[PDB]
Amino acid sequence: HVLRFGGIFEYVESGPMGAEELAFRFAVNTINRNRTLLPNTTLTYDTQKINLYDSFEASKKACDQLSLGVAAIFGPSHSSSANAVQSICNALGVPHIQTRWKHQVSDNKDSFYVSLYPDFSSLSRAILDLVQFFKWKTVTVVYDDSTGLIRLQELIKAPSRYNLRLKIRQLPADTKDAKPLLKEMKRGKEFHVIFDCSHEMAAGILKQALAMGMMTEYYHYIFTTLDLFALDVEPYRYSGVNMTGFRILNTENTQVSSIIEKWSMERLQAPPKPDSGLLDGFMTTDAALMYDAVHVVSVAVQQFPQMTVSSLQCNRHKPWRFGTRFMSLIKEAHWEGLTGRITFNKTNGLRTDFDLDVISLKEEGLEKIGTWDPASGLNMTESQKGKPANITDSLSNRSLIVTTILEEPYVLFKKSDKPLYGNDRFEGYCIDLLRELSTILGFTYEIRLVEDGKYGAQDDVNGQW
Amino acid sequence: NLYDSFEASKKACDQLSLGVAAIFGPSHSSSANAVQSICNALGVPHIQTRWKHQVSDNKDSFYVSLYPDFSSLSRAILDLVQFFKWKTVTVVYDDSTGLIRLQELIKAPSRYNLRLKIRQLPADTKDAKPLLKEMKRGKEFHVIFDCSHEMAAGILKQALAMGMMT
């Protein structure tokens, strides 16, 4: 017989196919071509077009799609559309397998849904375990979407028990305009930032943080999204910046590294964009979780062969007779995939047991620096040390602003011919100290003067210098 | 039945076949988002009475909300914190959307001297005593309880028994 796995995807008008849509098409063709998994069922897709956040049409296509009869409906990747189809699938018995995080309210009495994006009750614990490891005190959470507070719940709280000085800021609705925000972070000394965005807006927020000179070794970033490896970090590979994140897309096994490599070839027909900071042809996370969405229900239909696809009706509330059994086999699956272990939680169809791999920005790109289980905490690796090991050109590619004062043995204007500009307008002892410090460290330097005239002393009634 | 977004969509289509002029739709956000998506697609006005988090990508024209915007009230509470000269507060909210309802008060330490210490009630009702005992210790004198009035009465019954009505 033939199963009829459904699915809702946003189509770009004349943009070829959605990235999640390309996964769900190709992951069905993987099961049909490899008869090791499901040798006798031959799955079939029913992909429909859905407008950006239109909950009626997501209710309209799905009631049309349950008239065709499906065995599962793969979710609308939005939030207002997903809350609709979750309630269609609950009232008619069909499972509703989700791929992205919606705001789950505390009181939906629904059973027929599983989320495959990992829960932010566990992610916001994994952010704070990075904060506790780095021994920060001045965290500067920057979100972009209004539900980013929900995503960082356990980090917005705990200045209570874990003594922080959290300061919360929001990117405006001018989406590529983090310039007025980053001007307010350069002043006020916000060097420890927990940018909570998508990787599209995590790319363009770094190009605006490079041109402002906020990409020096003073700064440290703990980007929240599970897509940090899909950024072109080559402009930032040699700047000395700390840049920490996560990765759930397992890129370690020779098995799963082929699937990314196989379908980077396949979505090469899908044309890229200009230099928007992100690398081309990466199965980011959304096509990875939709890939795992096909398999975990495919290991559920394997353990339950007596299935049909009943042509259900929206008007009559006759539940799909196989529904309660087929939902219980989805929630009791453990089938491994791209994003690691895909075990579910009971008492809610979420994913609170998963395997993150903490990544960092080093001189060789983005490298794994540890791992994180929800019941094993943050297992960081041991650098264990190397050596200083020829400090001679460690500060190469740098640029430093040096401030001096005229002092006749140490700094004097070079009293000579026609006007000397740049660094040649100074001479003395500690100017000649820079000339043999820039030799032994290899940086560039611009001697500014002070504007005040002074050397530094505390104001008695104010405290400033 | 609220907490059910598909019965909210069927009874809306039953009224629109019956010929209503305006749906005064339900209270909960999972149901009211489904009703205004119907009321947008069929022209008919939806008139809301409760707070609902409008996603900023809902390009939707046919809804009005008579519940006052928490853009305004979280600037109203931030005025009272400054009128009372406070320097340390404790936002005790109730359910997960309380962080969304109080954005302009949580974003306030970025611009003022105010120093928030955000907390959250449990799923239960009379289990607020392990929370209030953790507020007595640590000297949490100034509290910005974000609850409904059903649970605003419930906390003060525990806050009396903890000896926190001083």
Added chain:
Amino acid sequence: FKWKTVTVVYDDSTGLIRLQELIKAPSRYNLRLKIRQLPADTKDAKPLLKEMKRGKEFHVIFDCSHEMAAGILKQALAMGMMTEYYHYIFTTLDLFALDVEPYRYSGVNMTGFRILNTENTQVSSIIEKWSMERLQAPPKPDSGLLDGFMTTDAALMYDAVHVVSV
């Protein structure tokens, strides 16, 4: 308790006679009494307790019966005087028969006495056996008394028959 300032709040006129050796105590020790007296009414203790909150009367030696020892603490809760600052010594022997359920988590440290020998199983059985014909009549719930316990006035009349029976 290392006290240096108390406030004897007695109930009727003979409370001065009942507490001679505590009123005569500033003559010999460092203790500094500030004797007060409840009104003729019951719920009129709030003008007294408001005059004790002002003046910082932290340490109180209420001399009342247990009927009015429950009545003051109901006003002393409503005045916000059940805190971790305040400390009450009750002179009655029926302290153990008060409803301390709304006062247990307050932070208060109510001290008193108890002459009932409620450790021995012989004594504890007679208190149980007496409760059967006492629960035949219902009490009022608003009083604030844990019903079923055997009061000191009932206990001494039980002992008065036996000490003559011996």
